[PDB]
Amino acid sequence: GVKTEQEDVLAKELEDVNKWGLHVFRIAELSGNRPLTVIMHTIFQERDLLKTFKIPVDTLITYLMTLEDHYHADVAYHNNIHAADVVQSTHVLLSTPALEAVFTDLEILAAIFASAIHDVDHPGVSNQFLINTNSELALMYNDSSVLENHHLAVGFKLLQEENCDIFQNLTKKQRQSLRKMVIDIVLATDMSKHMNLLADLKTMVETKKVTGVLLLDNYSDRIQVLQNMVHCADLSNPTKPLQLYRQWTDRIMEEFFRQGDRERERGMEISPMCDKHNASVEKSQVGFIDYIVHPLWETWADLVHPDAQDILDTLEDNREWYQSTIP
Ligand SMILES: O=C(Nc1c(Cl)cncc1Cl)c1ccc(OC(F)F)c(OCC2CC2)c1
Numbered sequence: 001g002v003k004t005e006q007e008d009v010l011a012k013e014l015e016d017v018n019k020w021g022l023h024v025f026r027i028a029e030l031s032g033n034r035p036l037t038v039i040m041h042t043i044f045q046e047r048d049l050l051k052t053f054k055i056p057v058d059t060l061i062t063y064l065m066t067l068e069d070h071y072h073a074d075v076a077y078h079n080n081i082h083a084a085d086v087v088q089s090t091h092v093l094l095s096t097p098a099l100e101a102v103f104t105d106l107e108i109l110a111a112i113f114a115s116a117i118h119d120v121d122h123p124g125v126s127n128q129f130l131i132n133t134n135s136e137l138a139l140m141y142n143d144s145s146v147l148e149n150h151h152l153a154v155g156f157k158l159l160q161e162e163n164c165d166i167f168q169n170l171t172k173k174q175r176q177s178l179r180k181m182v183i184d185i186v187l188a189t190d191m192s193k194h195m196n197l198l199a200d201l202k203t204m205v206e207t208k209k210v211t212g213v214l215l216l217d218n219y220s221d222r223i224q225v226l227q228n229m230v231h232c233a234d235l236s237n238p239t240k241p242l243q244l245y246r247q248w249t250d251r252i253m254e255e256f257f258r259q260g261d262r263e264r265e266r267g268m269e270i271s272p273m274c275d276k277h278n279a280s281v282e283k284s285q286v287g288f289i290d291y292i293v294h295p296l297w298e299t300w301a302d303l304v305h306p307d308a309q310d311i312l313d314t315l316e317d318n319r320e321w322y323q324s325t326i327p
């Protein structure tokens with residue numbers, strides 16, 4: 001009936017579940033490579049989601065382990081650690097003061113569930129790669145948001161495995177709403193949707209409205225914020241403590257170079273940033289931050305001002321670090 005010493009240390013690390021910069025890689029080691037399962041379980045208990053939606057605990061664990069098992073261990077970035085990270089980051093974003101009591105339980109569930117499934121069964125190669133190779137996935141999804149469409153399909157499909165339907169007790173109305181929201185969120189993680197998403201986020205900041213919390217009248221405005229929330233979580237690596245950010249950069253570059261190597265092998269053109277022979281890891285991170293991450297997080301910071309200042313400060317500090325690294 002006693003915890004193991006490894007479990008106790010895990011439980012201790014998990015006390016930082018509400019904090020930006022949780023040691024997510026340590027949780028991966030301590031949990032025996034089950035970071036997604038343990039972080040989801042904590043978050044669900046913390047937010048009382050098991051009682052609210054009447055999810056049996058064993059069904060939730062079974063679904064979680066199954067979901068985690070369909071992230072590929074041999075993929076350096078897009079794996080169960082990334083998933084766990086986006087879930088936990090989204091969880092922190094949800095608790096921001098400017099969003100207190102804004103979202104319903106079902107919406108919270110949609111944002112967390114969508115974060116958990118958002119890259120499931122990622123093969124470690126891009127949409128374009130899949131399209132240019134005439135992959136089956138590209139054929140099934142008509143070359144449109146191939147991976148993201150696949151992530152959703154697998155995420156819902158896994159509910160049908162043995163004792164895995166964690167939404168068995170929701171009404172049809174609840175399930176239809178959950179589903180639509182989760183599809184909207186995950187399909188918005190395609191980077192080809194980035195500019196639209198940001199444009200709409202800016203439009204929302206300019207027309208912003210409070211009562212001392214944010215006001216959101218319509219589905220359109222509510223889902224837009226949730227889409228941007230999870231997309232911010234997906235692009236949150238450079239806003240984390242440098243120790244963590246540096247590990248994420250190693251891993252994304254490893255994944256990119258592998259795709260690059262496979263692309264060279266096959267005489268294909270080598271996708272941006274995927275040539276290990278002509279890479280600028282530091283320059284690219286700076287470009288990434290100035291053109292994508294900073295404009296998004298700044299706009300997010302404004303929406304929730306002042307709540308996101310420390311996050312923005314770290315992003316800016318990490319940007320100077322990578323800047324000073326440039327040969
Ligand atoms: O693509 C990303 N994310 C991603 C998302 Cl959010 C959605 N869809 C696809 C991808 Cl690859 C992504 C995530 C992390 C990165 O670096 C660091 F933070 F680890 C990174 O660097 C760019 C690289 C060219 C300089 C890119």
Ligand SMILES: [Mg+2]
Nearest residue numbers: 118119189190
């Ligand atoms: Mg993705």
Ligand SMILES: [Zn+2]
Nearest residue numbers: 082118119234
């Ligand atoms: Zn992702």
